[model samples]
Target: TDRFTRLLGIQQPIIQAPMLGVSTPALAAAVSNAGGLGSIAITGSAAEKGRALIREVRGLTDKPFNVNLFCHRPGQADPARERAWLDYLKPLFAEFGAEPPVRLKNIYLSFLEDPTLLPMLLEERPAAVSFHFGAPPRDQVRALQAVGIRVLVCATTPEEAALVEAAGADAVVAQGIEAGGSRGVFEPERGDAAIGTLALVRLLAARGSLPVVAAGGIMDGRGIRAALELGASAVQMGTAFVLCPESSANAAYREALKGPRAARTALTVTMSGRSARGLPNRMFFDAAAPGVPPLPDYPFVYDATKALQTAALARGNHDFAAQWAGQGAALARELPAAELLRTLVEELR
Candidate 1:
C-alpha cells in the first residue's frame, strides 16, 4: 500500500521551502518540474515584481508552484525605542567599520501594506499561497481561496495552528524550533511558544482537524517519511535545498553551509529583528548577550544593519553576514534541485 502512488495536488510530497532572498524563479521551476511543489519567496517583493516572477517561473515549467509571504502585522515607528536600539548597535557597526543610522526605516511595513500584491496574486492564481509570521486577515485569506489558491500558514505551536485553521487555511506547517531563520511567531514581542518539530507536529495532529506539513531540521527522506507517519500530510525542507545550484545563496553562504561551524547553529535576532536559527557567528553572539536591548523591530533594524553586512562581506568576514540556516545546516549538500528532489522521492519510496 505504501508503494502505491497518487498525486497530492502536485508531484512529490516534498515542498521546496520558500526561503526569502534565497529562492528564485529558476529554483522554483526546477523543483516543480522534478515533481515536487516549487515555491518562491515573495515576502519583500513589490506587486509588479511578484507577478513578473510568477510569470517567469510559469514560463520555465508548467508544473504547479507556490508563493510565500511574511504576514506579520505592520510595524510602527517608536522613536524612543528606535533610538535605544541604535544606541545599542552603534558600537557593533563601528567594529564592522560602518556607522549606524539615526533613524530606522520600516522596510517590512511596506510589504504588508502594499495593496497591489495581493490582488496580483489573486489574479495569477498559483497552486498555493503560504503565510509566514502569522495568519493574514480572514477576509484576505478568503479572497485568495476564492480564487482557488490553496493557502498554507506556518504554526510554531498548537495554538498557532488553531488560529490558522479557524481562519480557514487549507493546511498548517509545523515550523519546528530546530528550523533555521526567523521565528514566524505572530507577536514577536510576546515571545515564541517554542515547540520542537516532533512535539509540535504531534500536538497539532492530535488537536486540529486541518492537514499539517512538518518543517524545520528535516533534511532527508527518512525525515519526510517520519513526518507522514507522525500524521503530517507532507513535509517541507529548507536546509536540504539550500545547496541547490539554482538557489540565490552566495558563495559565502554556501561556504558557511559547508563549514564545520554549521553544526553549531543557534537562534538569534542580531541579523534580523525576529529570532531565527542559523550558523553561529560572532555578531549574533555579541548582540544576543544580555543587555543588548532588543534589536530594532523587523525590517527597520534589519535595514540599518545592511551597510555593516556589506562592509563585512567585502572584507571576507562571514561573522556579520546573515548566514541563516537550520540546525541541520551541516547536512546540507551541493546538488541540483531536481536531483535532490529525485533522491528524496526515491528514499520515500
Candidate 2:
C-alpha cells in the first residue's frame, strides 16, 4: 500500500536537511522542484531576512518547502567559565597573529523568545516548519498548526520522540549520531543522547506513534531506501547536499570536502560551542588539547572561533575553517542540486 510513502505530503520521501550557513534558496528550490521537500535553515537570519529567503525560494519554484529554526534555552553568562575559555583560546589567536578579546562577548542569542519571526511564518504559511534543537512550547506549536504549517521536530532518542508526539508534532526527525551538524539535544546541559542512524530509526519506529523521518549520514538512494525499510516515512539529508553547486559553502569549505581526510570525520565542539560532527582539522585537534576549558556557549565560541578562522584563511591556512561534514562526505560529488536529486531518484528507482 505504500503507507509510509504516501503519509507525508511529499513525493519520494526524501528531505534535504536544513543546513544553516550552507543551504541556499537555489538549493531549496531545486530539491523542492524535484519532488522532495526542500528545506532552508532560518536560524541565523533576522525575521525580515528569513521571510526574504522564503520569497526567494518561492520565486524559483512553486513547490512545497520547509523552513527550519533553532529552539533552545537562552544563554547565560558564567563569568568565571567564560574567562577560563578565553584564557585557553588566547594562545591559538596569538598563533594566528591576532589578539583574543580579554572578555568573550556573547555574539548571538538564542531565538527561543524571538516571536518576531513567528508572524512571518504565520503569514507566509510554508508547507512545513521544523525545529532543530527541540519542540517549542505547546502554544507555539499549535499556532503554526493553526495556520496549516506541518510541524517537525528532531529527536535523538525514543524519549525525545515521545515528547514531540505528546506535544503535537506532525513528525519527529530521528537525528542519529552520524548526523553531521550539532546534535539536537533538548536540554543542552544534560549531554547528548547519541544513537547511530539505523538503531535510532528502529527505536523510534517501534515506540514513536507519530510519523518519523530518518536524518544523518544518508547520502544516496540506498540510504533513503534503507531508512524506509527501517520504518521511516521520510529521509532528511544534510551532508549529501554540501557539494551541490547551489550550496552557500565557500571555496575552502568545499575544497576541504574533497580532501582525503574528510573520510575520517570527528565530532568536535571547536567551531560552534555546541558539539557537531565534522572533519578533523588542526583547530579541532588543537582546541581539544590539554588546557582548553569547556567551550563557551554557541554564539560566543562561534564568534571567537570565526575571528581566528578569518585570520587563518587570510594568511592562506585552511586549518581554521569550520568545515562541517557528515561521515559520508567522501562520497560527495560536485553536481548541481537538481541533477543530484535526479541521480538519487534514479538510483532509488
Candidate 3:
C-alpha cells in the first residue's frame, strides 16, 4: 500500500467521490468495505441531516469513510437577478403547464456560513473531510486534524492548490476541467485556468508538500495507474461509480449515462450559474440559446432549474433534469460497488 492509503487507513488508494445528491450511505459504505475510501456528499444538508447521514454510514461500515462539504462563499440575494432568471424560465415552465416560482431562494447553504457543521463534524469525527469550491476555515481544519480527521480540499489550479496547502489541508484533490460537477475554483470571477487532470496531477505532485488526489474523468484502473505514475498519491472517481446500484442517481440520469448521450458532455454555466459538466438536454440548450437573460448566482439559479425539472418530470418529460457526468462517462460499467472495486484492483494489477 502507498503512503496515501496508509495515511487514510484504507487498503486501496481509490476514493469514491462524494457526489452531491448521488452518493448514498450504501454506496459509501460499500466502497469502504471493499478496501477503498467511501464518501458521502453533505454539501447542501443542515447539521441534523448531516448527522443522520454520518450515523447511517457508520451503521453500515466499520471501515474509514469521508464526508464532503461545499466551502463556497455564501450566496447573496439579488431581487432583480432572481426576477430576470425566473422570467426567463417562465416559458419553460409554461410548456409543462406550470409557472415558475414568483421568487428564488438560496437553496444550498455553504459550509462557510453553516453555523453547526463544524461542531457536527467534531462530534461525529469522520475519517476524512473534503471541501470543494474554496479553502475551508483554518481553525476548523486544524481542529478536525487534531481529532485524527484528515482534511482535503479540491483545487483546479496550482494557485488554488497553493492556497489549500497554506490552509493546512492534508491533501489537495486535483479536479480537472473534465470533472462532472461544479468546478472547485475558489473564485469563479477570477476565471478558471481550465487545466486537465493529467497536467494538474503532474504539477501538484511535483510540489510534494501534500498528497495529490487526482479527480475528473478517471473511469477505470488504467486511469488510476496513469495518475499514480504521474505522481498522484491516489485517485478519486465519481462517474465510475454512478452506475452502481448503491448510488442515488435517478432513472433519467442512469439512462443518460448508459445511452448514447453519455458520449457527449458539455461544460455549461446554465445548469447552476456556475460551470458544471453534464449531458446536454433541453434545459442546457434553452438556457444557452441567445436572448436568455443574465442568470442569477450559483444556488439561486439552481432553484429555478429544480422547479422547472420537477414540473417537467411530472409531465413525463426528462429533458429538464440535470444529468451530471464526466467526459469518461461513456466508459462507465454497471457493477456493484464491491465488484467494481475488485475489478478495478484486478485491472490495476
Candidate 4:
C-alpha cells in the first residue's frame, strides 16, 4: 500500500471527491466498499444534517470514508454589488417567468465559523476529513488530528500547499486548474496561478512535507497511473465519478456530461463569485458582461445562481444550473461506483 492508502486505511489510493450536490451516501459507501476512500461533502450542511449523512454512509458500509468541509471565510454581503447582480439576472428570471430574490444571501456557512461542526465531527469520527477552498486554522486542524482523524486540505499552488503543510494537514489535495467545482486557491482576492494537476502534483510532491493527493482532470486508470508517477500518493477523481449510478447527478447534468457540452469546460466565476471549472451555460458569459456590477462573494453569488436555476428548472430549462465538471469530462463513463472502481483499479494495474 502507498502512504496515502496506509494513512487512510484504504486498499486503493483513489478518492471519490466530495462533489457537494452530486455525491450521495450510496455513492460514497459504494466507493468505500470497493476499497477506495469515498467522500461526502458536508460543507453546505448544518452540523446536525452532517451527522445524519455520516450515519447514512455508516449504514451502507463499514469501510473508511472521507467527509469534506469548506474552510472559506464567511462571505461579506455587499449591497450595491448584490443589487446590481440581481438586476442583471432579472432578465433571465423574467424569461423563466419568475423574479430574482430581493437580496442575495450566503447559502452555505464556512466551517471556520461553524461552531458545532468540529464537535459533531468529533462525535461522528469519520476515517478522514478534508478541507476545501482554504485551509483550516492550525488549532482546528490539530483538534481533528487529536481525535485520530486524518486531515486533508486542497491546494492550487505551492503557496497554498505551504499553508496546508504549515497547518499540519495529513496530506495536500493538489487541486489543479482543471478541477471541477470551486478552485481551491486559499485566497480568491489574490487570484489563481491556474496550475494544472501535473505541475502542481510534481511541485508539491517534491517538497516531501506531506503526501500529495492529485485532484483535477483525472478520469481513467491512465490518468491515475500518471498521477502516481508524478509522485502523488493518491488521486482524487470528481468528474469521473459524476456519471456513476450511485451519484445524485440529475438528468440534465448527466446529459451535459455525456453530450458535446462536456468537451468545452472552462473556469467561470459567474456561477459562484469564486472561480470554478464547469460546463459553461449562457449565463457564464452573460453575467460577466462589461457593464455588470462586480459579483457578490463566493456563496452569495451561488445563492443568486441557485435562484435562477430553480426558476429555470420549473420552466423545463436547466441552462442556468451549476453543472460542474472537469477537463476530462468527455471521458466519463456510466457505471456503478463499485464497477467503476474495479475498472479503474484494473486499468491502473
lDDT of each: 0.81, 0.82, 0.90, 0.91
Can you write out model 4's per-residue Cα lDDT over 74-156, one digit (the tens) per residue? 99989898998899888999998999999887788899888999999998999999999888889989999999999999999
Q: Report the lDDT tens digits of candidate 3 across residue range 93-164.
A: 999899999888788889888889999999999999999999876887899999999999999999999999
Query: What lDDT tens digits, residue by residue, belong to model 1 across residues 1-349?
Result: 1211122367577788999888889999999999888899876667888889999999999988889888887776778878898777677777768777767777664335778878899889998899898888788889999988888899998778889988898888889998877777877677777888989888888788877888998888888888888888888888898889999999888988898878788887777777888887665756557797756667776776676677666667767777789877877888999999999988888
Better of 1 and 4 by TM-score: 4
Across residues 83-173, which tens digit of lDDT does each residue of candidate 2 receive? Answer: 7876777788777788766666665445576768788899999988999777887888899999888999999888888889877988899
For model 2, give the 10-residue run with minimal summed lDDT.
Answer: 1-10
How close is every model to the real structure, measured as TM-score? 0.93, 0.94, 0.98, 0.98
Steric collisions counted per model:
2, 0, 0, 0
Which 10-residue span in candidate 3 carries the lowest summed lDDT?
Answer: 281-290
Badly placed stretches (over 4 Å) of model 1 are 1-8, 110-112, 286-291
TM-score of 1: 0.93
Cα error of candidate 2 at position 221, Å? 1.1
Q: By TM-score, how accurate is candidate 3?
A: 0.98
